[PDB]
Amino acid sequence: TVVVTTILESPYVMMKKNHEMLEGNERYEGYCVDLAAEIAKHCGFKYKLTIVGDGKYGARDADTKIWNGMVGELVYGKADIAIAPLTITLVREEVIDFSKPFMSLGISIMIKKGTPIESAEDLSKQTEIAYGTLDSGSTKEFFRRSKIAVFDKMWTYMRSAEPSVFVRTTAEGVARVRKSKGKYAYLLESTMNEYIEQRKPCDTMKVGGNLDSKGYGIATPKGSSLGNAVNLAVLKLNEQGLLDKLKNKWWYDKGEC
């Protein structure tokens, strides 16, 4: 039985409303729960879904050099595979193996409906509408290291804006956009932006094209015997149109706006 590690993040993995009457894998539902079933079917294995112990995705402590979250569970042998919205990054690819991406994404802009902003360039040219990102992570790092004029201008602003424009969590960034009467725009992953856009109170909107490109991949321990099969399954699913179908179902078919 393959131990799958995942994380509670809507609409990827959520508790069914009646989860208390259920048990095992049936307690969960969502995009990744559906994806796990597909992968298992094509790779030919039985599995058990478990929620990552520390509820984190995967980062290496600069001091101890220890990995936490799902990457950690894979690295230290606590799980056999990770199916969740885990970004494929150089540092993680150095310690675990990733499948080809099952979803493509990029940094995007979230605004409260009605805000007169249509792109990052628009944000960089004005001042009365503040904007920020998570206080740590790839999105913040993207701006900090950019050599592109527009993003350099945005980073210069964000790094010294007052009050601070950074937030610690997604919920924090979304709430700020929603209570700032259009005076705050949040920079986040397009997938989350797109999801929130389809959820009540339906007062946010994703604008402009993505600022960068990346994707989520299924992860397995280095030199795992599941790596090859899982990679082929992800390609087969995309070719069959199933990845797009799954995305449309959990983002739009179940939308509230």
Cross-strand bridge partners of residue 51: 6
* Nearest alpha-carbon partner for 109 in 19, 174, 32, 161: 174
* Nearest alpha-carbon partner for 172 in 152, 202, 192: 192
Biggest alpha carbon distance in the chain?
56
The verdict on 173 binding ligand UBP (CB under 6 A) reads yes
Both tokens assigned to 28? 């969960």
Among 54, 93, 118, 253, binds a second copy (CB under 8 A): 54
188 binds, among Zn ion, ligand UBP, a second copy, none (CB under 5 to 8 A by kind): ligand UBP
The verdict on 6 binding ligand UBP (CB under 6 A) reads no
Query: Under a CB-based contact definition with an 8 Å cutoff, are residues 177 and 202 in contact?
Result: no
63 binds, among Zn ion, a second copy, ligand UBP, none (CB under 5 to 8 A by kind): a second copy
Cross-strand bridge partners of residue 219: 82, 98
Which of residues 13 and 233 has its CB atom nearest to ligand UBP in the complex? 13
**Which region, judged by CB under 8 A, interacts with a second copy, from 37-45, 53-61, 143-151, 185-193?**
53-61
Both tokens assigned to 37? 């079933």
Minimum distance between the CB of residue 12 and ligand UBP, rounded to whole angstroms?
A: 7
119 carries a ligand binding annotation: no
Find the angle CA(18)-CA(25)-CA(219) to the nearest 5 degrees: 130
Among positions 92-151, residues that touch a second copy (CB under 8 A) are 135-136
Question: Helix 31-43 crosses helix 227-239 at what angle (to 10 degrees)?
Answer: 120
189 carries a ligand binding annotation: yes
38 binds, among a second copy, Zn ion, ligand UBP, none (CB under 5 to 8 A by kind): Zn ion
**Which region, judged by CB under 6 A, interacts with ligand UBP, from 16-24, 25-33, 81-89, 218-226?**
81-89
Which of residues 135 and 253 has its CB atom nearest to a second copy in the complex? 135
The number of CA neighbours under 13 Å toward the Cβ of 222 is 8
- At position 13, the amino acid (one-letter code) is V
The verdict on 189 binding ligand UBP (CB under 6 A) reads yes
**Residues at the interface with ligand UBP (CB under 6 A):** 9, 57, 85-87, 134, 139, 170, 173, 188-189, 191-192
